[PDB]
């Protein structure tokens, strides 16, 4: 996260860390959507251009963390994966279209003051909240600049109109993505950056006071560059696929 | 393009797995 | 069911340092 700040304790209880067993390294962020289901970006697990193709056994999911490196005894819980589900039409060849994946945990995780799931939006919530100008919140342990932070970082960013997102890049953008960030003259800055992938972009509903996950950190070109924006997977647009997987498995 | 760092971590105890 | 309600904030009626910025943008 660029231009963010240290998160408060328990501020993002659905935040999950995708950790590689060997070598031990932070692969991506992710989010807890239930006692046994984790949501992340499909490219965190499969990306042929960089020779990335992880299997269940190559990963660990750490939940309830704040410090990036420390093993938080009595606070964080570690789970192993039973199965990974990548969207069948995830487009790694061109623009990371449908960059979404579900991960089923071996055993349900017990909730605590530091571990609690986020809500997935419904058509109504998606419609009323996903509008240009409205701010969401992104969290992660990724790069602080285009090194890494000691604890979870947070940054609030405004959703940008689709035309503006399209005209800022040469990449073909789809209905399954949205972009966020401040424009060059707005005076404020901030962005997600490498290491933040898979993390949640959330918004707090003013109707029922709940936090909903509207996006997944997907991609960008550089970090916090003027006239450039971060791109996120549109969670609601892919909710049908999400439900289908959870119902079948 | 798509979003480890390597700023090394504290070992995870076996009893946590 | 209890999704999106944080034990240390919503459940105690305590708000975090920047959540107001989000609500203030939902005009």
A173: which 2 tokens? 């953008």
What per-residue string of b and e applies to A14-27 under the rule 16 or more CB within 10 Å gives b? bbbbbbeeeebebb
A33: closest chain C residue by CA: C3
* A169 to A2, A41, A173, A179: CA distances (angstroms): 20, 21, 9, 11
Asked if A49 contacts B12 with a C-beta cutoff of 8 angstroms, the reply is no
Asked if A160 contacts A232 with a C-beta cutoff of 8 angstroms, the reply is no
Give the count of beta carbons closer than 10 Å to the beta carbon of residue A52: 14
CA dist A148 and A129 (Å) reads 31
CA end-to-end distance (rounded Å), chain A: 34
A186: which 2 tokens? 């707005």
**Which residues of A belong to the active site?**
43, 99, 197
Specify the resolution in Å: 2.0
Phi (first) and psi of residue A142, to 5 degrees: -75, 180
The CATH number of the structural domain formed by A13-117+237-248 is 2.40.10.10
Chain B: touching chains (3 or more CB pairs < 8 Å): A
B8: which 2 tokens? 């090394």
CA dist A129 and A91 (Å) reads 27
Q: Which residues contact A235 (CB under 8 A, 6 or more apart)?
A: A39, A100, A120, A121, A213, A214, A215, A216, A242
* Beta-carbon separation of A137 and C22 below 8 A: yes
CATH of A1-12+118-236, one of 3.30.430.20, 2.40.10.10, 2.60.200.20, 1.10.760.10: 2.40.10.10
Nearest to B3 among A44, A80, A143 (CB): A44
State the CATH class of domain C1-27: few secondary structures
Write down how long chain B is: 17
Range list for CATH 2.40.10.10 in chain A: 1-12+118-236, 13-117+237-248
CA end-to-end distance (rounded Å), chain C: 27
- Kindly write down the DSSP assignment for every residue of A31-83, as one continuous string: EE-SSSEEEE-GGGTEEGGGTEE--GGGEEEEES--BSSS--TTT-EEEEEEE
A48: which 2 tokens? 């042929």
Phi (first) and psi of residue A204, to 5 degrees: -95, 120
Cis peptide before A23 (omega within 30 of 0): yes
C27: closest chain A residue by CA: A134
Phi (first) and psi of residue A7, to 5 degrees: -75, 155
CA dist A177 and A197 (Å) reads 14
Alpha helices, H only, A146-233? 162-166
CA torsion angle for A75, A141, A173, A95 (degrees, to 10)? -100
């Amino acid at each position: 996260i660029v231009e963010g700040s240290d998160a408060e304790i328990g501020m993002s209880p659905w935040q999950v860390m995708l950790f590689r067993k060997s070598p031990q390294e932070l692969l991506c962020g992710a989010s807890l959507i239930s006692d046994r289901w984790v949501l992340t970006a499909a490219h965190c697990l499969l990306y042929p251009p960089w020779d990335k193709n992880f299997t269940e056994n190559d990963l660990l999911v750490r939940i309830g963390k704040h410090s990036r490196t420390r093993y938080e005894r009595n606070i964080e819980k570690i789970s192993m994966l039973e199965k990974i589900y990548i969207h069948p039409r995830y487009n790694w060849r061109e623009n990371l279209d449908r960059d979404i994946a579900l991960m089923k945990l071996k055993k349900p995780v017990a909730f605590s003051d530091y571990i609690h799931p986020v809500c997935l939006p419904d058509r109504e919530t998606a419609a009323s909240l996903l509008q240009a100008g409205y701010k969401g919140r992104v969290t992660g342990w990724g790069n602080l600049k285009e090194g890494q932070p000691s604890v979870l970082q947070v940054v609030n960013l405004p959703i940008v109109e689709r035309p503006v997102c399209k005209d800022s890049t040469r990449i073909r953008i789809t209905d399954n993505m949205f972009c966020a960030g401040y424009k060059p003259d707005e005076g404020k800055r901030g962005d997600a950056c490498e290491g933040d992938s898979g993390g949640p972009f959330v918004m707090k509903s003013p109707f029922n006071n709940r936090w909903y996950q509207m996006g997944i950190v997907s991609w960008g070109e550089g970090c916090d560059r003027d006239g450039k924006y971060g791109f996120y997977t549109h969670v609601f647009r892919l909710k049908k696929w999400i439900q289908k997987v959870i119902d079948q498995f | 393009x798509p979003x480890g760092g390597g700023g090394d971590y504290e070992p995870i105890p076996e009893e946590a797995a | 069911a209890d999704c999106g309600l944080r034990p240390l904030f919503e459940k105690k009626s305590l708000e975090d340092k920047t959540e107001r910025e989000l609500l203030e943008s939902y005009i």
